Design a protein around this nucleic acid. Sequence first.
RNA 1: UUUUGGUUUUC
Length: 368
Amino acid sequence: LRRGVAPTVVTYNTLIDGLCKAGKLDEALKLFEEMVEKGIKPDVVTYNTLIDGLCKAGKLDEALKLFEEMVEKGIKPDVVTYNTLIDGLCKAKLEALKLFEEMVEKGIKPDVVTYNTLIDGLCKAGKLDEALKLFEEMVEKGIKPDVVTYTTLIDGLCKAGKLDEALKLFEEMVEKGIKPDVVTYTTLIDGLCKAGKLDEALKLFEEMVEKGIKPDVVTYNTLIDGLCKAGKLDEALKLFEEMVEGIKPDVVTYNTLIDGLCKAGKLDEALKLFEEMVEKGIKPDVVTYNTLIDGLCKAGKLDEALKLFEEMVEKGIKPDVVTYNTLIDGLCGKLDEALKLFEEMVEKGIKPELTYRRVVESYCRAEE
RNA sequence: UUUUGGUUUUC
């Protein structure tokens, strides 16, 4: 902190980076003000850091202001600036493409990260043909696809249902000497599980280790989820144990099991898992409470579901739109209660398709 | 010092 050593702009950028990635955007922004007050000019990296923090914190519009502020100052937005906005716009919407042409008009060549950012956006938007189009184009520009590039297309193909094309594209990635990492293998493993081929997924998982590729928690979470969906609830509890025998399970690990257990009716074993993660200092997020609220709702235990909603609120976890979609749906026949909860998420500041669909079908069989 | 890929919830 302090410090007879005068901080550099590099010093504030690091702290601003750490603050933004800790959600602490308001605290990340007072640092911005402090540094001008000392006569230390925020640079392009300073704006790019705050812009990224704003996008990932869902304040896209606030980030677009910062882009305008920097331009007004003569602090030129660069390839990183555009890459940051393009991803931010993709993840919110697919505006990102006008920036991809705008950056070229500023003399900024798009790079491998730009192409990777847009290929993913196009896939997650159902525009896989468009994404494959960009893949061809970047090889034309002499941009060499990397492990992220090939992993983004393998994911999209799988999620579109083109698992064998995914398997084919992975094959050529080793031909070109691009070494797959744990994210690559997990993506194929997730794809095989989503496609009902659990043993082909374990075969690959073992091939991942024999290649010397160490799994992480996502890998096991992916594998555990495949086991819960497949109905292999015990083999997924085995995997949760074997996991430690040295990977630390995380919240998503617990969320996945808690969900498998809820959907099977094993509400007890779910609640004691929810108790174990807390005691183990693993904080339940919003999916944790969403999973249990739906579980208790589908089971006919709405009072306990509402009880759990309060407790989630009584603990600083903010309920999102899934929370309300679940509860709103859950009250089928507490007409006004359901309607009540809809206005409450408006006042809380949560953008509502399912929400509207559920309220109207509630209004109708109750023309309002 | 800043930007891109993989896992869980409202079926």
